[PDB]
Amino acid sequence: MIPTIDLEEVSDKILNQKIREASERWGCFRVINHGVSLSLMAEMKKTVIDLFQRPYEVKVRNTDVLLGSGYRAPNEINPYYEALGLYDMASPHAVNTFCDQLEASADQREIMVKYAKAINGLATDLARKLAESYGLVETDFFKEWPSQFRINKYHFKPETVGKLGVQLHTDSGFLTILQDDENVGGLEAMDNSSGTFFPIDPLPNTLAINLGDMATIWSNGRLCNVKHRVQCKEATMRYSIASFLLGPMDTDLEPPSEFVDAEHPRL
């Protein structure tokens, strides 16, 4: 069962411990009182629905920077899935480039810029809190790590009902912040101690956090890179916004020394 964590918990040591234990045992958690404007989130979702209605030949202009960071149309691999996105979402130039490509209106440009900075602010706060929950000295470990923005459109038709939308996976980055569709949902995750699945329902004004492959590597196996998938529950349209804190660009990432020792051998 995925825990919900109150980011306005007054005690840092209780908050950090709750974050750490969620992240170790389940690899994901929900946050409430996250500090992100609710109206900004709703405005982002409307912008997303609108960006996906852009002419096809406009969407194809969303070109890759990292492989897969740009536009993807549904195909025979992922029949129900369409996506747009941008690499280095912490860079205002990257965000504007994306807005240029998709012919974002002025308002839409500003929504994106303010969403990017808010969500990215939250991601770096959660990352610092994870370092704090371990009592690490490297409380700035994430500061040269790029983030990636991806917006998704799921199209489920009546034949899809009762089966999966996209199949089971782990994210490859460090941490992911998901603004899921409050009206649809169906995200599910594997409990590694039983193989049983539990749901991550879209509770309104909340965000879903999950950890990825980079977090397990970084914490030398302690953080759970959770396995998850989205199941189709009804033939409908579903929109989600994902923000990925990735690992290092350049460098090949290994763990802070504190994590590696005789009882926790290196990986």
- 155 labelled binding-site residue: no
Cα dist from 149 to 18, 28, 119, whole Å: 27, 19, 10
- 238 labelled binding-site residue: yes
CB 223 within 8 A of CB 23: yes
- Smallest gap from residue 226 Cβ to Mg ion (A): 9
DSSP for 208-263? EEEE-HHHHHHTTT-S----EEEE--SS-EEEEEEEEE---SSS-----GGG-BTT
Q: Which residues bind Mg ion (CB under 5 A)?
A: 171
CB 228 within 8 A of CB 237: no
- Smallest gap from residue 5 Cβ to Mg ion (A): 19
Main-chain phi, psi angles of 164, to 5 degrees: -90, 150
Residue nearest to Mg ion (CB): 171
Identify which of residues 171 and 180 has a Cβ nearer to Mg ion in the complex. Answer: 171
- Smallest gap from residue 49 Cβ to Mg ion (A): 20
Identify which of residues 15 and 178 has a Cβ nearer to Mg ion in the complex. Answer: 178
Identify which of residues 88 and 171 has a Cβ nearer to Mg ion in the complex. Answer: 171
Identify which of residues 43 and 180 has a Cβ nearer to Mg ion in the complex. Answer: 180
Identify which of residues 171 and 181 has a Cβ nearer to Mg ion in the complex. Answer: 171
- 93 labelled binding-site residue: no
- Smallest gap from residue 228 Cβ to Mg ion (A): 6
Sign of CA pseudo-dihedral 49, 52, 58, 59: positive
Closest to 227 in 3D by CA, of 241, 207, 211:
211
CA gap 263, 221 in Å, rounded = 12
- Smallest gap from residue 227 Cβ to Mg ion (A): 9
Binding residues for Mg(2+): 169, 171, 228
Binding residues: 152, 154, 169, 171, 228, 238, 240
